[PDB]
Backbone:
């Protein structure tokens, strides 16, 4: 077992050294009103971590359009980072645009409880999705040998933002839920009176007083969430 | 901050009370040479949680074909679980086949660190993926208002099994990685001599001595992984 | 092996989430000049716990006649509480009018020492009777498999209120004590002088200087109390399953 | 606030001094297959406590019939206990048949957590109902100024022994529950499978898969419980004063 | 072993409940400029203890004469105390005029180190003689089976007040010492010069510079002292049985 | 607040140095089947303490007759002890026959809690009465300025031995108790049955079931005890000054 | 081993009971500008300690002339001290003029660490030479069975005072040192420059730059120191 | 303040590095049945410390005559020890024949509590006299600025070996004591009986039972001891400067 930050907490305040200079987290993104996805990797010059980085760079604009910034993390030095980044640019022809935290002593890794049992000395495959108030909203821990599905991270941020602004909860598999489709859920009543008030008016499709929904998302928001999924599902028609 | 089991650790030994009776974890599944996906949810009779159980139920066969069992967990009592399962069968027309742990006191949730700060009481949307050896291979922590993408849980298990059998690492977005498509990665040389022996021959497509791959996964394995994604991406044509 | 509030202590200050919203205890009732009876139960959708609720509900008027409120407590979520109350209303025809604290973790149960060894998980069947100044006057611990006698809880509050207002102690089985029937007890003298003085003036019936009584309770008080007992002893003439 | 034994736990092992002699609890009763009701009272030669002792004594045969022994507990000495009992016999004409633990130092009282905050010194007015295997099945804490209802204690032991031998749970206000009357409840299914297997049946009325009951108690047992309750409700036609 | 107040120390401040009411010690006696003798007893309705109370009661005037009050202590309640006193007054024909501390939980007993190992529960036979400034001047601990010699307690109080007023030390067995009889001792010199200056003139007889005495007590002090002893030595000419 | 050995406890094991040699306590006396009375003093060459030593010496025969040995204790050295004893023998004409413990650092005094607050240094005036099995039966703590009544110590030892052998409790002021005179008390009954069984027979007068006595002490024993008291009561006819 | 005051430290502040009355140390002596020699003894009425008291008594005038006071300490009471002094005066014909501290509990003894491992009871034969500013200058610990050489204590104090006033160190066996006789030593240079600046005369006979001395003591001081020694050496022509 | 070994305790066991090689204390001298005097000094190449070494060296035959070895101790290295020794042999004409402990880190110094508060660093002028059993018999702590009187150290060892063999105590200023001259004291009696048996007949001059003495030393013993003091008193007739 190990110590870790928790969903709902503010990302710990910390200064970090990155590819692009020293930054303070979560301050640096918060103050620009931006969310940030922080993903860690066990080491530079490793194949899975390279495919993940390429996948993220290709999804950079999509993240940016959602108000989201990307920042990576590795136990390696900034010098390795830049060399690794340089290799990716040269051999894959893609420039990684986001910064990468250099954590030579798991100081940061440890502070975030990213040092699991799958291997002493090489950071787990952690993902923190932090919002504009510096709050941890989701954490993903994939294994060292299994690459992330970056399109899901986008779906998550997309649905979360829609949730936050439309004051709704998001069904399983949104926007293709089997029961309500792209519908969004109204938060359940937490008092008898609220349950009665809801059960009667006809405010919105309900299966029961604790299960009501409507379709408030715009056709463009749904369509965007939907293309992420279509992209994850399509066979690539190119390669390298 | 809070204590969690770690990836690579053996799932904590414990006897739990479920919908189907007492079970010892992970023994019960390990003894059958079965992997199990344990997911938790804040509370019975809540809409998102309900959409997820229906999603899991619909994909039960897919898990069974991979030799994967499902087990839920919640802070509610077994009497609520059953009344809840009964309501779902009666109103949605689908019976939930797997058990649900009843953890009225947080004993199980505290033990697994599933009690975050998104809300005292009521568990986080945790997901542990455990292999037939009783080893935790992946942990996902979605937020209370965001339903999981169940098809990604299938991909994870599918690709992991493939990686274990074929002794390969899996690229991001597999099986539709932009760089190598459905190919699987050969674990990187960790010594100079191994690196030389590798950049040295007609073995396997390589971008560098640390980035080599082949396509050892069968057509059916790949297609299976690909239909989960197509499912996730397809707009439902019925709506229960 | 346990630890819990004590009689005479003030009910621990706390904010609880219920069926009806968040509530501060004991403030919510003290501020209204009301006593309250808090009772816990291991779980929603259980037989015995359902019969107790219906019983308390049938007796609701009797408690509010006494200026007493009712509040339940279970380890379940407010969502279960609500479906369970909906199931009772719908299949038994009685609406539970009082709030039920949802204690999903055991925070409230643990804080009240309501977590016994009859079962890890699930609160024991605890009952706390609390007066209008927020002081615990009586606590009852019935077992998981044995429903409570709601009429006795009414007799206790009624008798405690009488004892308080008339400054008297209440004999066993009142108002049908075998020695003094409905008589109420004068607090025993605590000094020799007081004892000498009490005897000396047939002011009121005495068996000895430490045992004196009179009958200051109104006929209404007395028989309202005998009525709770009458009701408990009566075989029902209807039966709701029916 | 304080530490106390809990329902479900075995009664603390201990040797106590009573006005009948030294007794080991819960052993002395366990070994006879007897349940025991231990009740504490703050002090000898006090009004309320005397009316309770007389009430228990008059009902002594009813407890004995159920195989339940009685044992009191007070902070006073055995000498006081004996003089007190002597007074009760002489002035009220009733002999207290059960022993009384003498606890000059709330050792026992503290051990049972019976030292509340209603008063430093002078034990709480607590009652523990322990079964024949030495397990605490019920605990009642009545205030110092309020005598207990001994017939409710009889009801508890009767219903509990019934629930035990018939493997049933007892409804509120049994045997006069408003919903199922003298009916006893079948313990709810704890697995999806038991719930489904639970259908109407003959004898086994059900309001739901978790609410099933039958009427297995003999007419004598129902009558016996019912009379404790009638007795508690009836005004005595003869006051011992 | 156990902790106890010490000779020379102020009697522990504390509020106690007695069968005459709540009292603060030693304040309640200090503020009256009265000495008090506090004696403890293991239990009410015990024989040795009853003979001591009567002996103390019969000698009450002698204590008043000295400006000394009496106060007993027992683990029992105020109710048992009053009943016990009633029994003594009714069966022995003597009323106990002084209060008795009721210490249901050895709260008081423990605070005074009165809980020895002669028996868990039931306080030891301790006696505290306390002067009008609240200072512990003497402590006595008799066994549970041995009645005190109340006349020696009177002798101690008398001699102590005498020693105090006259600035003198009291010889063994005073006022019947075999060396100097009713003589009272002059505190010995603590320095060489005081010792050299000390010479037996006029009123001082000296066996050495450290052993000097005179006879400053009044004949009334000496005879009252002697009377307590005569009384103790005299075989009663009646017997209250 | 200080730390004492308690009545009922075995006298602490310890090796001490006395002016007769090194001795182990209580072993030395217990091994001879003897009782001992250990009395402490604040210092050699002090008046009160000298009168006490002389009083004890004159009563040495009486202690021996009871199978009791004496042992004193002071904070001074063996050299002072011996010089002091020599001074007593030469100036008063009496040789002190019992040993005195030399406790130059208070080691023994602290071990026995004899270091009170009546003065740092210089031991209190304590007395321990220990029986032949090494158990402390009585403890007396007299002030620096008040000499003890040695005859009362003899009375306590006599009475206790009678009590032990005849299995009886001793009344206040025995053998001149005002209620039963030289009678010895039968230990009270501790159970109801035992109390009913009690009987006022011919050799067991009773005032109540808890208060019975008889007169099993031989005339000699009673006589021996009455003369300790008479001796304390009598004005010496020849003062040693 | 044991706690203990140390040379150079201030004599511990404390009030003591003596057979002349209560005294505060070192204050009582410091305030009169006097030095004091405090000697402890194991017991009153012991032969060796008595020969010592007589010895000190005879040399009382000598200590007075040096501005030094004497004070004894023993574990016994003031009453023993006085009987003991009375016995010496009467049997030996000499009155002990100084006070003796009465230490019934080893309060003082323990405080001065005078309770060695030769008799847990009864104080060691300790001597503290204290100067006028309350500072311990010497500590002698003789055995229980060996009487002290009181003239040596006179030498030490005489030497020490000379050394203080003339700012010099005292050679072994002064004033009869075999190398420099009555010469007193000039404090050694502690730096290279001081050592050079120090030469031949330029102020004082030298055997090396770290060993220089002169003869600054008057003939009376030297003769006084030497008479202490002759007295120590002569066989008494009387015997008391 | 600080911790030191104490008279009567065994000299701490320890291996030390010296001028002459590694040696274990006190075994190295004990195993030869030799006593040893260990003196420490703050620093090599210092004036006072040099006059002392020379003085010890000059008296070396006198120490050997008595079976006593010498060993020094300083904070400096063995290299400085030998260089210093070499300088003394070359400039003063005298070779130091005994070893010197080299204690570069106050290890030995701290172990012997020789690290006093006149100077952090640089050990005090301490002297330990140890008998052939490795027991500490005397400790002397002279100030940094004052050299020792080596002849007094010889007197101590002479007198101490004398006392030990003849079982006598040595009076002040022996062998020139003002009261008994060269007489040696008989250890005082520690019990009344030994004291009574002690008497001054023929040999035994006694001033009291606690002060007896004889003259058991040989004329040689007495005169050698007197010689040490005589040398200390004689103005040298040569001076090595």
Residues:
């Amino acid at each position: 077992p190990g110590s870790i930050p928790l969903i709902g907490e503010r990302f710990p305040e910390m200064e970090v050294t990155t590819d692009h200079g020293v930054i303070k987290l979560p301050d640096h993104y918060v103050s620009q009103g931006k969310w940030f996805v922080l993903f860690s990797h066990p080491a530079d010059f490793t194949p899975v971590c390279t495919t993940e980085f390429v996948s993220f760079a290709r999804r950079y604009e999509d993240f940016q359009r959602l108000g989201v910034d990307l920042i990576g993390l590795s136990v390696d030095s900034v010098f390795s980072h830049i060399k690794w980044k340089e290799w990716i640019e040269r051999h894959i022809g893609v420039r990684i645009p986001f910064p990468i935290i250099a954590d030579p002593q798991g100081t940061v890794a440890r502070r975030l409880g990213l040092l699991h049992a799958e291997s002493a000395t090489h950071t787990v495959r952690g993902v923190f999705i932090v919002d504009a108030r510096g709050v941890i909203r989701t954490m993903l821990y994939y294994p060292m040998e299994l690459g992330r599905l970056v399109d899901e991270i986008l779906r998550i941020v997309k649905a979360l933002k829609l949730g936050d602004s439309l004051k709704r909860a998001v069904p399983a598999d949104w926007p293709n839920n089997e029961i309500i489709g792209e519908g969004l859920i109204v938060p359940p009543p937490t008092t008898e009176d609220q349950a009665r008030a809801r059960m009667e008016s006809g405010q919105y499709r309900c299966l029961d007083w604790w299960f009501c929904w409507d379709t408030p998302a715009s056709r463009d928001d749904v369509e965007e969430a939907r293309r992420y999924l279509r992209r994850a599902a399509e066979k690539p028609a190119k390669l390298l």
